[PDB]
Write a protein that binds this ligand. Structure first.
Ligand SMILES: O=P(O)(O)OP(=O)(O)OCc1ccncc1
Ligand code: F3S
Length: 309
């Protein structure tokens, strides 16, 4: 069995920053450090940080006075932020710069009382945080997940309309949603393409190349990782068996029995050590040397705040 590794895979700049923010905070101030939501959607990362004294909460009312609070990479609403800001808490923001970018555009539109549509998945913390930047009741903020959602949306003023997206969506599906927005709302304004980040785009392109060669694709990532789920789905839509797995123990032998070529990738929140262990397990199951595919070079790094060096 041949083992192929997707490229790029694994950690993006936002995840590496966000985890570093929590680690550094722990080093500097000691336990406990409170974190609003899982810092990234990865069980191994989260369990590790919890073992070191990070306490993960959903609501700010769970955090005691005087405490250090870190917002997760996914971002937070203005309401959450103001709810923290009014309290005695020392806040560090691990929100990925590429999510903040979208937040600022929503805020701009709200200031103008002009309606905005976000493309994204209901209930995801990034969607809650981005929708949560809009507060002007004279305008409006609408969530759409599909062309069908576009087809039934009505707005108050379609002459003054803009759209934004979640950073981790399917590039292909999002393109269909945008085509629908533009047919329904010909004057809608957006970015040139979408707000899908470089890392999401690149991993999706990489898993497409992988799935062209591999019969089976393993995506290292947790169940609640949006971007990780998109990688698995992409592979599945190409007719390959694909599994989203937290670690090597999750691999079932039937999945790779008599498979001549297995591919491995990792979502943006999955540490490389998890991939190494997955490879080690595939080798126990008869795989040879892991072969990295040729891939687009990524070179972006986001630094921690100077307050946390
Ligand atoms: O893919 P997810 O949105 O569920 O988050 P994740 O798996 O934690 O990846 C990091 C991240 C954070 C912020 N925006 C994009 C990606
Ligand atoms: S939005 Fe940021 S957290 Fe990673 S997946 Fe994209 S660089």
């Amino acid at each position: 069995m041949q083992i192929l590794l997707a490229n790029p895979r694994g950690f993006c700049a936002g995840v590496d920053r966000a985890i570093s923010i929590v680690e550094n905070a722990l080093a500097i101030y000691g336990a406990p450090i409170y974190v609003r939501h899982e810092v990234v959607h990865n069980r191994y990362v989260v369990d590790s940080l919890r073992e070191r004294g990070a306490i993960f909460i959903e609501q700010i009312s769970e955090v005691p006075d005087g405490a250090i609070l870190i917002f997760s990479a996914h971002g937070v609403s203005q309401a959450v932020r103001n709810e923290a800001k009014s309290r005695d808490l020392t806040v560090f923001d691990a929100t990925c710069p590429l999510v903040t970018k979208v937040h600022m555009e929503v805020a701009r539109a709200s200031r103008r009382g002009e309606e905005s549509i976000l493309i994204g998945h209901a209930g995801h913390p990034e969607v809650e945080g981005t929708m949560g930047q809009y507060s002007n009741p004279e305008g409006g903020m609408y969530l759409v997940e599909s062309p069908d959602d576009v087809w039934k949306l009505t707005v108050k003023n379609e002459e003054k309309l803009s759209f934004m997206t979640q950073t981790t969506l399917s590039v292909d599906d999002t393109s269909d949603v945008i085509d629908a927005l533009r047919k329904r709302f010909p004057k809608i304004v957006g970015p040139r393409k979408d707000d899908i980040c470089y890392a999401t785009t690149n991993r999706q392109e990489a898993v497409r190349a992988l799935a062209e060669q591999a019969e089976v694709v393993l995506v290292v990532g947790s169940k609640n990782s949006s971007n990780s789920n998109r990688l698995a789905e992409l592979a599945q839509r190409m007719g390959k068996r694909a599994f989203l797995i937290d670690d090597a123990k999750d691999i079932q032998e039937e999945w790779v029995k008599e498979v001549k070529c297995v591919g491995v990738t990792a979502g943006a929140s999955a540490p490389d050590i998890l991939v190494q262990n997955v490879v080690a397990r595939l080798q126990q199951l008869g795989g040879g040397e892991a072969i990295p595919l040729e891939g687009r070079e990524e070179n972006i790094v986001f630094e921690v705040p100077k307050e946390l060096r």
